[PDB]
Amino acid sequence: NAVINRLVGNWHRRAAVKFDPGRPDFREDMIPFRGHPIWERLSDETRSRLLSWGWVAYNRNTVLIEQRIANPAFELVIGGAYPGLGGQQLELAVAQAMVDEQYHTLMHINGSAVTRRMRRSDFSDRVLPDSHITTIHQEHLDRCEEPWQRSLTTLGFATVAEISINAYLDLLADDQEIQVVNSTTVKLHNRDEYCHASISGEMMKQVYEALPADRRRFLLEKVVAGLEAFVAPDFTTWESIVAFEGVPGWEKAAAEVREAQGGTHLVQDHSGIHTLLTEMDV
Ligand SMILES: [Fe+3]
Ligand SMILES: [Fe+3]
Task: Give the chain's domains with CATH numbers.
Answer: 1-282 (1.10.620.20)
In 40-129, alpha helices (H): 44-65, 71-79, 88-119
- In the reported structure, the alpha carbon of residue 250 is separated from the centroid of ligand 1 by a whole-number distance in angstroms of 33
Which segments are annotated as binding site?
66, 101, 104, 162, 189, 193, 196
Separation CA 182–CA 172 (nearest Å): 8
281 CB burial (10 A radius; 0-12, 13-18, 19+): exposed
- Residue 142 near residue 209, CB atoms below 8 Å: no
- In the reported structure, the alpha carbon of residue 66 is separated from the centroid of ligand 2 by a whole-number distance in angstroms of 7
Q: Which residue in 90, 128, 102 sits closest to 16, CA to CA?
A: 102
Q: Which residue in 52, 20, 49, 60 sits closest to 181, CA to CA?
A: 20
- In the reported structure, the alpha carbon of residue 155 is separated from the centroid of ligand 2 by a whole-number distance in angstroms of 13
For the CA of 104, the nearest ligand: 1
- In the reported structure, the alpha carbon of residue 171 is separated from the centroid of ligand 1 by a whole-number distance in angstroms of 15
Resolution of this entry, Å: 2.0
- Residue 60 near residue 185, CB atoms below 8 Å: no
- In the reported structure, the alpha carbon of residue 196 is separated from the centroid of ligand 2 by a whole-number distance in angstroms of 5
Q: At what angle do helices 132-143 and 44-65 cross, to 10 degrees?
A: 40
Separation CA 223–CA 277 (nearest Å): 10
Separation CA 169–CA 189 (nearest Å): 8
Handedness of CA 13, 15, 219, 264 (dihedral sign): negative
Q: How far is CA 206 from CA 85, 86, 202, in A?
A: 7, 11, 6
- Residue 242 near residue 179, CB atoms below 8 Å: no
- In the reported structure, the alpha carbon of residue 270 is separated from the centroid of ligand 2 by a whole-number distance in angstroms of 16
Which segments are annotated as binding site for Fe cation?
66, 101, 104, 162, 189, 193, 196
CB atoms within 10 A of CB 221: 14
Handedness of CA 137, 32, 268, 15 (dihedral sign): negative
- In the reported structure, the alpha carbon of residue 45 is separated from the centroid of ligand 2 by a whole-number distance in angstroms of 35
**Residues whose beta carbons lie less than 5 angstroms from ion ligand 2:** 162, 196
What's the chain's length in residues? 282
